[PDB]
Design a binder for this molecule. Structure first.
Ligand SMILES: N[C@@H](Cc1cc(I)c(Oc2cc(I)c(O)c(I)c2)c(I)c1)C(=O)O
Ligand SMILES: N[C@@H](Cc1cc(I)c(Oc2cc(I)c(O)c(I)c2)c(I)c1)C(=O)O
Ligand SMILES: N[C@@H](Cc1cc(I)c(Oc2cc(I)c(O)c(I)c2)c(I)c1)C(=O)O
Ligand SMILES: N[C@@H](Cc1cc(I)c(Oc2cc(I)c(O)c(I)c2)c(I)c1)C(=O)O
Length: 553
């Protein structure tokens, strides 16, 4: 039996949580109650299989079981086509209601009146809005979410204790989702081979002292864990994630010094911990890379006898000595290395042909460096809000066909690079910036994939996982774009508009700015400020009031 094996390892609590998440991700539109029913049914059925390893239907596969239940065009089919159906029907932007939170004491009352149905509610909502959310990590946020309500609903003030914590979680939860969406995207659209180079390059940075073989073993287990979680096999994903966490801590000494504090904590915590660990200290005198990848006379021989192992060696060796290069950059270097060998090892005298492969890197290393230097200087010179606005105008012209809400969302997140990275030293800026930029653009890419409207976004998105950022950066203002005429329905007055927060106000104003740019693409930074300021003054006066709606009329 498979259901039992899992129930035993994950324990009932997690098992119920994971199954609930699994369904909420497969059916983002079904009510909360209905899902619980399906869970409990599945949960009981497994307990029998825990007692009777030979009971009825315990020989099934998690997919068939979960499949059948969810079925009480996709269902009219069978395993595995039937599963690939639900996976293929996951929505990255469901038409689901805005997730607002009632009055503090309101939530607090229900957190007590029923603590379980409260958490399942959380997991339910989060899973359904982020159909790819890393299940194991969700269990982490769930416990931290719980901790909040148990400590904050029992204090002098609550909306000063709780809320602040509910803010940080939503944010951290939004980054975790985006971060995991890129991993799923990498596996699916580009294959695991692509994901393996990625994890190899990154773990080698985190763990410079680990010998290549250890990094391989970790990349392997890691690829398995993420494949499962991205494929909807949550129960096994969690189980495998825990085994991996256990392996890491045991061999901790041959991996990284930073794992010490991580390893001493409860399962959920140390897994999250291991995932966020700082790079270990890099070893001192490491032989020059050239010696074995350029000067050696067996380069071409090793490339043929074992390309996969050799290129891996290359990535591993280059990454471990470059914690200052973004993962995507190291992959571009890896790729150039491969291209230069593929051609060189056929020509007359290979050694001469690829003797200058490092020279071809310089160009690829500086392009990222400069861009990061410029927008950090710009950042300081404008502040986050002003900074996002400049990106907003820049990107709106590159891809004017993209819908307003998306452009605002994406631009804002691209704008956060500035505050999130620039406060770091050059040495740590590029990996922070470029790897973060890659996550945001994946958002653009996945949202855009639903209802495509720009072949320029499509090309940059599907052409190469590694060049996306440079691809978007290179884009010139789209001239084939025809000015979007004035609607006005966009600015229909609404009472809320006058009692908004700073966050809210900036968002409307950025929405207004995109519409402005989509309307007059040939505008100047100067005349855009003019139209904005006047319109900002207009809304400010009309909010002064009297018969407001008459004012905005
Ligand atoms: N900035 C990147 C770099 C990074 C990627 C991976 I791949 C990784 O290996 C794990 C191991 C476990 I265990 C997890 O639960 C997860 I998620 C990732 C680690 I460490 C760091 C990121 O954090 O995505
Ligand atoms: N006034 C500067 C010009 C400049 C404007 C922007 I807006 C900017 O920000 C981005 C961020 C990303 I991410 C991109 O892909 C691109 I293209 C531009 C940067 I850096 C520089 C000068 O003349 O030096
Ligand atoms: N139609 C929306 C409400 C809405 C009204 C206005 I008037 C508006 O336009 C601006 C322009 C600037 I410039 C501002 O600083 C601000 I605040 C609002 C926007 I965007 C939205 C609804 O019904 O939901
Ligand atoms: N008389 C014009 C109509 C017109 C109305 C507005 I109100 C306006 O100003 C803004 C300000 C912002 I801020 C926007 O995002 C947008 I779209 C338009 C402009 I320019 C033109 C005609 O019919 O030709």
């Amino acid at each position: 039996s498979e259901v039992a094996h899992r129930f035993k390892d994950l324990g009932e609590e997690n098992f119920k949580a994971l199954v609930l998440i699994a369904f909420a991700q497969y059916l983002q539109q079904c009510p909360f109650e209905d899902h619980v029913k399906l869970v409990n049914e599945v949960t009981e059925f497994a307990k029998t299989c825990v007692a009777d390893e030979s009971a009825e239907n315990c020989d099934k596969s998690l997919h068939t079981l979960f499949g059948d239940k969810l079925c009480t065009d996709c269902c009219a089919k069978q395993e595995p086509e039937r599963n690939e159906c639900f996976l293929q029907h996951k929505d990255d932007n469901p038409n689901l209601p805005r997730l607002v939170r009632p009055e503090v004491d309101v939530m607090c009352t229900a957190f007590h009146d029923n603590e379980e149905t409260f958490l399942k509610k959380y997991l339910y909502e989060i899973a359904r809005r982020h159909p790819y959310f890393y299940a194991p990590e969700l269990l982490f946020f769930a416990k931290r979410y719980k901790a909040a309500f148990t400590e904050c609903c029992q204090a002098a003030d609550k909306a000063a204790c709780l809320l602040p914590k509910l803010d940080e979680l939503r944010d951290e939860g939004k980054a975790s989702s985006a971060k995991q969406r890129l991993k799923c995207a990498s596996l699916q659209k580009f294959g695991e081979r692509a994901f393996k180079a990625w994890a190899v390059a990154r773990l080698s940075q985190r763990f410079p002292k680990a010998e290549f073989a250890e990094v391989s073993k970790l990349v392997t287990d890691l690829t398995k864990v993420h494949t499962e979680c991205c494929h909807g096999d949550l129960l096994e994903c969690a189980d495998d994630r825990a085994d991996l966490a256990k392996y890491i801590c045991e061999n901790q000494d041959s991996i990284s010094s930073k794992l010490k504090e991580c390893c001493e904590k409860p399962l959920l915590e140390k897994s999250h911990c291991i995932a966020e660990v700082e790079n270990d200290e890099m070893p001192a005198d490491l032989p020059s890379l050239a010696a074995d990848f350029v000067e050696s006379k067996d380069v071409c021989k090793n490339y043929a006898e074992a390309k996969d192992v050799f290129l891996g060696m290359f990535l591993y060796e280059y990454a471990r000595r470059h914690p200052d290069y973004s993962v995507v950059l190291l992959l571009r270097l890896a790729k150039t290395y491969e291209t230069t060998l593929e051609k060189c090892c056929a020509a007359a005298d290979p050694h001469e042909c690829y003797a200058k492969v490092f020279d071809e890197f310089k160009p690829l290393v500086e392009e990222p460096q400069n861009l990061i230097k410029q927008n950090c200087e710009l950042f300081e010179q404008l502040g986050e809000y002003k900074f996002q606005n400049a990106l907003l105008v820049r990107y709106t012209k590159k891809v004017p066909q993209v819908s307003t809400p998306t452009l605002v969302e994406v631009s804002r997140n691209l704008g956060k690079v500035g505050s999130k990275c620039c406060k770091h030293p050059e040495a740590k800026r590029m990996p922070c910036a470029e790897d973060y930029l890659s996550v945001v653009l994946n958002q653009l890419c996945v949202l855009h994939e639903k209802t495509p409207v720009s072949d320029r976004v499509t090309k940059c998105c599907t052409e190469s996982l590694v060049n996306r950022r440079p691809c978007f950066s290179a884009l010139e203002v789209d001239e084939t774009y025809v000015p979007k005429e004035f609607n006005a329905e966009t600015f229909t007055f609404h009472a809320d508009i006058c009692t908004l927060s700073e966050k809210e106000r900036q968002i409307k104003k950025q929405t207004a700015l995109v519409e402005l740019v989509k309307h007059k693409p040939k505008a100047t930074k100067e005349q855009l400020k003019a139209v904005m300021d006047d319109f900002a003054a207009f809304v400010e006066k009309c909010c002064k009031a009297d018969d407001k709606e008459t004012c905005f009329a």
